Amino acid sequence: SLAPEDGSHRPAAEPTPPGAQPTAPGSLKAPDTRNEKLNSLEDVRKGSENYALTTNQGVRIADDQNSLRAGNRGPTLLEDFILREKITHFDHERIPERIVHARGSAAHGYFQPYKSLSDITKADFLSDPNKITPVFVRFSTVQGGAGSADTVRDIRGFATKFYTEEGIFDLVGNNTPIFFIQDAHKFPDFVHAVKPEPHWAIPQGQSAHDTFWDYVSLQPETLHNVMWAMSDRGIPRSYRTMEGFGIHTFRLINAEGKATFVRFHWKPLAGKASLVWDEAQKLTGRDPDFHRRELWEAIEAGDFPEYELGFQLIPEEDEFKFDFDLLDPTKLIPEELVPVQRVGKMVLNRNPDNFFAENEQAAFHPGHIVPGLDFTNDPLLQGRLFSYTDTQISRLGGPNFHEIPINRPTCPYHNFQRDGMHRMGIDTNPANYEPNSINDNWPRETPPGPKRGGFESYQERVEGNKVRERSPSFGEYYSHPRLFWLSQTPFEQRHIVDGFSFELSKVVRPYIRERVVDQLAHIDLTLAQAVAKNLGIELTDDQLNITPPPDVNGLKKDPSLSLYAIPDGDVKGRVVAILLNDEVRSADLLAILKALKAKGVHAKLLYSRMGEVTADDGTVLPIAATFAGAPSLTVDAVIVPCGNIADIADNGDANYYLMEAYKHLKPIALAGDARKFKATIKIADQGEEGIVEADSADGSFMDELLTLMAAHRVWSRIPKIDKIPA
Amino acid sequence: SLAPEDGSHRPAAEPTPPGAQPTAPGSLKAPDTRNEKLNSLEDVRKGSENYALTTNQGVRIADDQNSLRAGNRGPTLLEDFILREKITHFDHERIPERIVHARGSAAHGYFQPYKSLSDITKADFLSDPNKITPVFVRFSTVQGGAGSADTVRDIRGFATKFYTEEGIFDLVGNNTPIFFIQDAHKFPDFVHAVKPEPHWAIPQGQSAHDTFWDYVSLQPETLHNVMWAMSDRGIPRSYRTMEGFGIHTFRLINAEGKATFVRFHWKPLAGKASLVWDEAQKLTGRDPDFHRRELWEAIEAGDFPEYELGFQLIPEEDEFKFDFDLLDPTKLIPEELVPVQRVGKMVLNRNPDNFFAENEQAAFHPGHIVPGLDFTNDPLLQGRLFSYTDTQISRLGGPNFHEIPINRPTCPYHNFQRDGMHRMGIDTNPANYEPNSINDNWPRETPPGPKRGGFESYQERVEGNKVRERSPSFGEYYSHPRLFWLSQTPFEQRHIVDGFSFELSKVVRPYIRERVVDQLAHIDLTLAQAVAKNLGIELTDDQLNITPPPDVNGLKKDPSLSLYAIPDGDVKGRVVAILLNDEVRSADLLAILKALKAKGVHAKLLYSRMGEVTADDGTVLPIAATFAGAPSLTVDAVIVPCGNIADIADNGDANYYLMEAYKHLKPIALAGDARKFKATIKIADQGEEGIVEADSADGSFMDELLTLMAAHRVWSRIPKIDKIPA
Ligand code: HDD
Ligand code: HDD
């Protein structure tokens, strides 16, 4: 009726590259992609086609265009129950956003272990290489609201809901291996300091303001995670190209009752990759939804995000083996000292149907563990256990949040709990208490055991007085920031310097900048001096003579802490901008697209207008976006084929497209007379590494380009970009 | 004591220009700024200095750094009531955001009428020129969440709470004179279409997506307000430089019972000023809080936002004398036919103390009127009256939202309502019903009268059948969009074309773009043709033969609809970037700052690092921000004094500063050897209009620059900017 005659409104129910088709609810885009959790949601999924429009009570609506009034130009009547029901539901759509991590993007998937881990844990989802566990994963920022932007400088959340046969296990982690603070009692202080300031509620999604750096300067325990946030780790290219960490030391418990200390890791199969600051900041304006969009479209394209689960394992007798306290969440465990042992793989392969119902209402909580796992006395973890249950009473409207469909266990659950707001389950048990005789005491307790047993805490020894006191072993603040610093490449170190420098320049009270620079001088004097230089601060002789902190158990570096030191690039799922002209050389475009498709690299055809152009072939080329509509920020490299280059040679948008990408260190490839654009980016006739150029886009032209893309960015270009006006 | 000895942590409690000092709660920044509402809030204002840190129950806390645990490396104890109270409050901080207009910034102020209006309304706050009414005003966007960006393309809200002696009057308006839809029954449809789409919750703060333009293409009633949104009205420079409108026709009722139709207007004393799209979009990334910050800092500087309240007045016998229906909210009343008559002045002169408590919790509702005002049968207004009461039950936690301090009337309030969540008032009335004898029927009804009388509705005639039916008089959709289009300058028209073009290029389904272009052809074929060519669309012969709509009561143009046809910009409160070098020519800087001060124009001194530089005469210049930290987006003009120009001539950030300013049509002034920068912006030796240049910054130099600033932007430069790579 209102759909177009040609059916061009519906996306195909098959994988398609980003921007090819309109995005769609997961059940409509990929109906053949299934798992036990997705199937269990069938009871609450609602269709639409061939159904009448009704009230919520089932009454068909004849006229959904008008209120009921006395005369067609008269007052609206109170008896219009259809209008009032519709407006009432609208009026109450919103619920409180998460206190932290309010901005997030989520997807369905499954996990599978590589081998049985029965020797170290009795957890059922790790017991058998053929046990598939559905998952729901939500990635997030930390500071900003649910409507804030994606590519901010911040920590990222990485929360995984495991729907196991013995209960929900929530692995609630971040993208760095430590947190800012040591004891949960300080969590409201730290969060209030990083959040928008209370008088005017500025700034959104940014730590670059006085109260954050005030707190940091007075609490050196924060410096380690601050180092990570100021590095390019704070601006990932994609949720698909960052690491995950549980941060805390947990425990594994095997059938014989032996405990092993464990820290959890997620390693991205797509490799580690981050933006650079100028690109990330501008991208929050050009596309505040970039990461959300990029995740959704990768899944629709079949570039399923994949992550390997890994364990750092520490025997109980090695609790005190390292310089740092194992239970201190501001300290990491270097992989040089304790390797990450691979455990299994997780694949995210379907988007939700309704963002609010599945993402916004999802509730993750690290206290949701299962038999075979346990906690430790990490005093940050200890307080988290209180928070994630408590907070849901207001956010999700009461204690039945486990009945919201996305949150439901796929395994059975039965107990004597009753009532509460929006109670869905109707209990037939004659008893609502135990011990009872009137239902023969069902449901019954289960003794602990090797499988399908009841939960019992590990009986660890407790000895001490009731004290509010920090462990002295936690009182070391500079050695891990320094190890992180020393493990970065030189260009990563420069980016850290520029992060501190840019943020401290937004601090209005100069003494705070100075006090932060003083803390940096306790970490590394090269770092401190470089930041000071950019702030017009001069270190004193006392600061220049601060003794550096000790090495971490003899380490001078750990290359696993760098994003880039150990190559792990993968071009699959990346995207290239192809800048068209009105008579493209079809031979160039043919060879370009063939090579990109063979490596799984997507392309977007850009022009100065929408519609189509015709190549020299007579081939009609559809235009994905304009140069301004899809800035170089949104792509990984730029290719300019030959053709009628005079068409775009004096186009300001086209020339700036290349300058912006050049500034942000991206690979650029120019064919034929497109090489004339070298003048725009101040490249000499002789060329330079990172600019592919040839008479035509044939032979090794695309191999060179794809090799550059596998290395992510052209770091050697950095000394040249400070002269580029872009 | 953690504060610096020199007291530099504390801003001065006197007016200071933007950036000079840290911002502060209004009671601390401007303690002497008072009004009756601000005084009435004193009962709930909390101090801090010289108080002990306590629990919410008043118990002093000894150690706010640690949880209570069994041993200093032990588990946290459930008996830690201090921890659990602190974390519980943190866990429940967030409340639901507003369904629409969730993003907004507010201030305190006062209103005064110019003359008694007793002849046309018995409203007490308009009865006496010596009667001052306190106000609380919230400006907002519409689509995005509370954490979204300020300078988006959107309609803006302009809500004013008048605390009158006869009750609260809320004037809840927008910055355009019409709304998108005719009947409130369709509000959830329109809002769902513009909001982030439901499968993936994209895009934030943007109408540039499929579902919005789908709805528009199928509901031509939306086209008038769409035209306004696509113009530079949709991207204001500042809440201080936009207009406000009540949109609906309301009624004024005088003491003799005579009704006059009225539409409400706010006219900014700072004049009308807007950004351009590329600037606004980039600014949502460089400073998503730009409007919130600019409002707060203008008030701290003494640049108080001021607006003139004005009335369009139509006698009852003139109801049907126009080509359009007065009760249709998609139609404006041209000022050429019905002039805005000046009524009074509103000054916003103090910021809040706590954003959440005063801004986030404020509740405005257009059903809050007072005797002397009444409604009409406008079917959008009619449904609004239901919604603003209903929505607060969830957003503010129940029916006692009028007891939240910011919402409280300053006049008396007494009735027989009782109980409800968070009930504050403790009633002593023996009776909670009327009629009653046990309290001699107090509080009592009051007959209507000329002053201090009870509210009685105007007894307008109602005749017709109970129908869900649109008024035939509303069935015209193109003549007011055409009137707006033909009232704009040629460069405003270009920006409208480019607004439609940019947004429709982000619509993935091409037939939606085609259907919108077809709607445009029913408005004006020059507009339709210009948009279609940017989309690669060819109008058909039939489309080129669509008859345009007629003039609106003889009007092709109304001058009041253009932002700029008659410039009315005050330069006071604007800001100029001054690009420093390491040996600035002090004679230049003296002349520059002398002239800016005389016009109340602020300055920010920028450089490549923070700290200080020394001028050629030894003056130490403090640096406000770096070139990258305070981009040209954030200022109105750029001046480059002479000095050691070689220091910055090769700086890529400095050159780009000018190129970005140039592209966005801002005045630029270059003294002495700084004229070398003309090459970067491709200005010929001979000069051009909008680039001020001379051997030195003298008297004539700064007059030319400030004359350009008075005209806001250099529109004559538009033909040159498409060749600039920026
Ligand atoms: C004692 C308070 C407290 C502390 C110390 C932490 N958190 Fe937390 N976190 C919360 C209290 C909280 C919360 C208030 O309970 C949130 C907000 C809303 C919610 O459901 O849980 C939350 C949300 C939250 C989310 C978002 C989950 C989602 O997508 O819904 C993640 C990923 C984390 N946290 C991760 C961490 C990590 C890695 C921490 C340090 C190791 C951490 N949190 C410390
Ligand atoms: C029947 C539904 C409905 C309709 C047709 C409208 N609104 Fe509305 N408006 C609401 C339902 C609503 C609301 C849902 O009740 C809000 C959101 C939360 C709230 O407190 O009120 C609101 C908020 C709201 C605000 C923000 C107030 C603040 O700062 O808190 C403004 C300025 C407006 N509206 C203005 C308008 C204008 C100028 C309209 C057309 C002439 C309009 N609204 C139509």
Tab-separated table of N, CA, C and O and ligand atoms in Angstrom, chain A residues 98-101 138-140 157-159 172-174 179 181 184 187 245-248 329 362-365 380 383-384 387-388 391-392 395, chain B residues 87 90-91, ligand 1:
chain	number	residue	atom	x	y	z
A	98	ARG	N	21.773	3.532	33.434
A	98	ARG	CA	22.775	2.980	34.343
A	98	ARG	C	23.564	4.110	35.007
A	98	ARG	O	23.865	5.118	34.367
A	99	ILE	N	23.906	3.948	36.297
A	99	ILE	CA	24.666	5.003	36.982
A	99	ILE	C	25.979	5.267	36.253
A	99	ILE	O	26.390	6.424	36.063
A	100	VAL	N	26.655	4.196	35.837
A	100	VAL	CA	27.853	4.246	35.013
A	100	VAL	C	27.649	3.258	33.873
A	100	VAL	O	26.791	2.375	33.940
A	101	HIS	N	28.452	3.416	32.815
A	101	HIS	CA	28.313	2.606	31.607
A	101	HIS	C	26.925	2.751	30.969
A	101	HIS	O	26.397	1.795	30.378
A	138	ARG	N	27.438	-6.907	26.132
A	138	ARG	CA	27.241	-5.467	25.993
A	138	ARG	C	28.577	-4.763	26.206
A	138	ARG	O	29.260	-4.999	27.212
A	139	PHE	N	28.973	-3.954	25.223
A	139	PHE	CA	30.139	-3.080	25.300
A	139	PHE	C	29.666	-1.682	25.649
A	139	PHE	O	28.535	-1.309	25.324
A	140	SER	N	30.530	-0.900	26.295
A	140	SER	CA	30.082	0.401	26.786
A	140	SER	C	31.259	1.358	26.975
A	140	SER	O	32.417	0.944	27.012
A	157	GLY	N	33.654	-0.671	28.838
A	157	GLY	CA	33.147	-1.894	29.444
A	157	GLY	C	33.011	-3.035	28.444
A	157	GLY	O	32.844	-2.836	27.234
A	158	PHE	N	33.063	-4.257	28.980
A	158	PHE	CA	33.005	-5.499	28.199
A	158	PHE	C	32.346	-6.544	29.112
A	158	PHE	O	33.030	-7.246	29.859
A	159	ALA	N	31.011	-6.618	29.050
A	159	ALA	CA	30.192	-7.445	29.932
A	159	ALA	C	29.603	-8.616	29.151
A	159	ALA	O	28.971	-8.414	28.109
A	172	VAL	N	31.900	-9.433	34.103
A	172	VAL	CA	31.671	-7.997	33.936
A	172	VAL	C	33.003	-7.259	34.003
A	172	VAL	O	33.475	-6.906	35.093
A	173	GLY	N	33.615	-7.017	32.841
A	173	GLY	CA	34.970	-6.521	32.766
A	173	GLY	C	35.083	-5.212	31.996
A	173	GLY	O	34.093	-4.631	31.541
A	174	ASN	N	36.328	-4.752	31.869
A	174	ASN	CA	36.651	-3.534	31.127
A	174	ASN	C	37.733	-3.869	30.109
A	174	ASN	O	38.188	-5.014	30.018
A	179	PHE	N	41.687	-1.162	37.533
A	179	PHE	CA	40.768	-0.047	37.698
A	179	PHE	C	41.480	1.120	38.383
A	179	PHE	O	42.654	1.035	38.780
A	181	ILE	N	40.697	2.662	41.269
A	181	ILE	CA	40.700	2.746	42.725
A	181	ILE	C	40.795	1.351	43.338
A	181	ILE	O	40.567	0.334	42.677
A	184	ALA	N	36.054	-0.188	47.141
A	184	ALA	CA	34.740	0.238	46.656
A	184	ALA	C	34.165	1.422	47.419
A	184	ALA	O	33.321	2.135	46.867
A	187	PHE	N	34.287	4.417	45.359
A	187	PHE	CA	33.704	4.459	44.017
A	187	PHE	C	32.835	5.693	43.786
A	187	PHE	O	32.989	6.321	42.727
A	245	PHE	N	39.206	-7.612	30.085
A	245	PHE	CA	39.810	-8.080	31.331
A	245	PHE	C	38.764	-8.091	32.437
A	245	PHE	O	37.988	-7.137	32.578
A	246	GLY	N	38.758	-9.158	33.239
A	246	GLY	CA	37.927	-9.161	34.428
A	246	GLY	C	38.478	-8.313	35.555
A	246	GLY	O	37.740	-7.996	36.494
A	247	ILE	N	39.762	-7.954	35.470
A	247	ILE	CA	40.505	-7.122	36.415
A	247	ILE	C	40.815	-7.845	37.728
A	247	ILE	O	41.993	-8.074	38.047
A	248	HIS	N	39.786	-8.205	38.500
A	248	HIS	CA	40.010	-8.851	39.792
A	248	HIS	C	40.551	-10.271	39.652
A	248	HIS	O	40.249	-10.996	38.696
A	329	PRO	N	43.392	-4.348	42.741
A	329	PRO	CA	42.891	-4.165	41.374
A	329	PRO	C	43.508	-2.989	40.631
A	329	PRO	O	43.104	-2.731	39.495
A	362	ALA	N	18.913	-5.070	29.903
A	362	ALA	CA	19.798	-6.143	30.348
A	362	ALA	C	20.487	-5.737	31.647
A	362	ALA	O	20.887	-4.582	31.816
A	363	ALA	N	20.632	-6.701	32.566
A	363	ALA	CA	21.225	-6.473	33.881
A	363	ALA	C	22.392	-7.440	34.064
A	363	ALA	O	22.185	-8.657	34.133
A	364	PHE	N	23.611	-6.907	34.135
A	364	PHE	CA	24.804	-7.713	34.375
A	364	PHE	C	25.297	-7.466	35.797
A	364	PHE	O	25.175	-6.355	36.322
A	365	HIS	N	25.876	-8.496	36.425
A	365	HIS	CA	26.335	-8.304	37.804
A	365	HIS	C	27.428	-9.309	38.142
A	365	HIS	O	27.194	-10.520	38.033
A	380	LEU	N	37.771	-4.001	46.135
A	380	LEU	CA	36.935	-3.374	45.119
A	380	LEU	C	35.838	-4.331	44.681
A	380	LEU	O	34.651	-3.974	44.648
A	383	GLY	N	32.945	-4.790	47.326
A	383	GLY	CA	31.849	-3.838	47.346
A	383	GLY	C	30.988	-3.866	46.103
A	383	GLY	O	29.787	-3.584	46.180
A	384	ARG	N	31.576	-4.184	44.939
A	384	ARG	CA	30.766	-4.391	43.735
A	384	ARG	C	29.638	-5.384	43.996
A	384	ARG	O	28.526	-5.214	43.489
A	387	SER	N	26.561	-3.694	44.988
A	387	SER	CA	26.006	-2.630	44.160
A	387	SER	C	25.088	-3.171	43.063
A	387	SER	O	23.987	-2.643	42.841
A	388	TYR	N	25.514	-4.223	42.363
A	388	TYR	CA	24.795	-4.593	41.145
A	388	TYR	C	23.423	-5.195	41.421
A	388	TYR	O	22.562	-5.149	40.540
A	391	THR	N	21.288	-1.688	42.716
A	391	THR	CA	20.971	-0.666	41.723
A	391	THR	C	19.780	-1.048	40.846
A	391	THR	O	19.088	-0.161	40.333
A	392	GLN	N	19.500	-2.345	40.669
A	392	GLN	CA	18.425	-2.726	39.754
A	392	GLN	C	17.039	-2.434	40.313
A	392	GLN	O	16.077	-2.393	39.536
A	395	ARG	N	16.469	1.034	38.710
A	395	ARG	CA	16.653	1.063	37.259
A	395	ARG	C	15.631	0.190	36.542
A	395	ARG	O	15.089	0.581	35.500
B	87	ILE	N	26.948	3.769	49.130
B	87	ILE	CA	26.811	3.102	47.838
B	87	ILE	C	25.352	3.018	47.426
B	87	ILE	O	25.040	3.086	46.228
B	90	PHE	N	24.448	6.264	45.819
B	90	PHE	CA	25.074	6.303	44.499
B	90	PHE	C	24.302	5.438	43.515
B	90	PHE	O	24.006	5.867	42.392
B	91	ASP	N	23.917	4.236	43.954
B	91	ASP	CA	23.240	3.243	43.125
B	91	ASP	C	21.882	3.714	42.631
B	91	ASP	O	21.343	3.127	41.683
C	1	HDD	C1	30.700	-0.483	44.208
C	1	HDD	C2	30.399	0.108	43.058
C	1	HDD	C3	31.043	-0.320	41.789
C	1	HDD	C4	32.398	-0.551	41.584
C	1	HDD	C5	33.546	-0.444	42.558
C	1	HDD	C6	32.453	-0.954	40.153
C	1	HDD	N1	31.263	-0.944	39.533
C	1	HDD	FE1	30.742	-1.470	37.605
C	1	HDD	N2	28.913	-0.938	37.868
C	1	HDD	C7	28.344	-0.607	39.057
C	1	HDD	C8	28.991	-0.457	40.230
C	1	HDD	C9	30.375	-0.579	40.483
C	1	HDD	C10	26.824	-0.423	38.984
C	1	HDD	C11	26.385	0.921	39.559
C	1	HDD	O1	26.169	-1.477	39.718
C	1	HDD	C12	26.544	-0.600	37.492
C	1	HDD	C13	25.798	0.587	36.884
C	1	HDD	C14	24.411	0.100	36.490
C	1	HDD	C15	24.509	-1.379	36.692
C	1	HDD	O2	23.653	-2.193	36.357
C	1	HDD	O3	25.663	-1.720	37.280
C	1	HDD	C16	27.923	-0.896	36.902
C	1	HDD	C17	28.118	-1.116	35.595
C	1	HDD	C18	29.255	-1.750	34.996
C	1	HDD	C19	29.278	-2.241	33.601
C	1	HDD	C20	28.191	-2.162	32.583
C	1	HDD	C21	27.414	-3.472	32.486
C	1	HDD	C22	26.344	-3.326	31.428
C	1	HDD	O4	26.712	-3.275	30.236
C	1	HDD	O5	25.152	-3.226	31.789
C	1	HDD	C23	30.524	-2.751	33.457
C	1	HDD	C24	31.087	-3.379	32.214
C	1	HDD	C25	31.209	-2.580	34.749
C	1	HDD	N3	30.417	-1.948	35.625
C	1	HDD	C26	32.524	-3.012	35.035
C	1	HDD	C27	33.294	-2.689	36.248
C	1	HDD	C28	34.663	-3.005	36.379
C	1	HDD	C29	35.524	-3.700	35.357
C	1	HDD	C30	34.988	-2.514	37.635
C	1	HDD	C31	36.291	-2.524	38.360
C	1	HDD	C32	37.071	-3.591	38.321
C	1	HDD	C33	33.750	-1.933	38.161
C	1	HDD	N4	32.733	-2.051	37.297
C	1	HDD	C34	33.645	-1.306	39.486
